[model samples]
Target: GCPRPRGDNPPLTCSQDSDCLAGCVCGPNGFCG
Candidate 1:
């Protein structure tokens, strides 16, 4: 799962699972872990 954002913004952007941290996934909206 992606970590919670600090503010009213999304997390790091991503294109695929490889872009996220271990155990986390890249969401369809392009958010990374």
Candidate 2:
């Protein structure tokens, strides 16, 4: 898994909240906030 931008409505990929951009959180769908 890799970290992606938060503004990307549905992140490309994210393992955890830390992987997502600021003010963003990871989802069960395997996307970033």
Candidate 3:
């Protein structure tokens, strides 16, 4: 799985899962959706 970066995406400062974009999530992964 790879997390595609969303253009115009807001800076990631997520404190929870819901903060990330759909199909994407905040985790140990620092690349690809």
Best by lDDT: 1
lDDT for residue 12 in candidate 1, whole number 0-100:
81
Ranking by lDDT: 1, 2, 3
lDDT of each: 0.74, 0.65, 0.55
lDDT of 1 by residue, 1-33 (tens): 555547687568889899877778877788775
Instruction: Give the alpha carbon lDDT tens digit for every residue of 8-31 in model 3.
Output: 775455556666667756565443
**TM-score, predicted candidate 1 vs. hidden true structure:** 0.57
Best by TM-score: 1
User: Residue 32 lDDT in model 3?
Assistant: 24
Ranked by TM-score from best down, the candidates are 1, 2, 3
Candidate 2: worst-modelled 10 consecutive residues by lDDT = 1-10
Model with the higher TM-score, candidate 1 or 3: 1
- In candidate 2, position 20 carries an lDDT of 62
The local distance difference test score of model 2 is 0.65
Higher-TM-score candidate among 2 and 3? Answer: 2
Off by over 4 Å in 3: 1-3, 6-11, 28-33
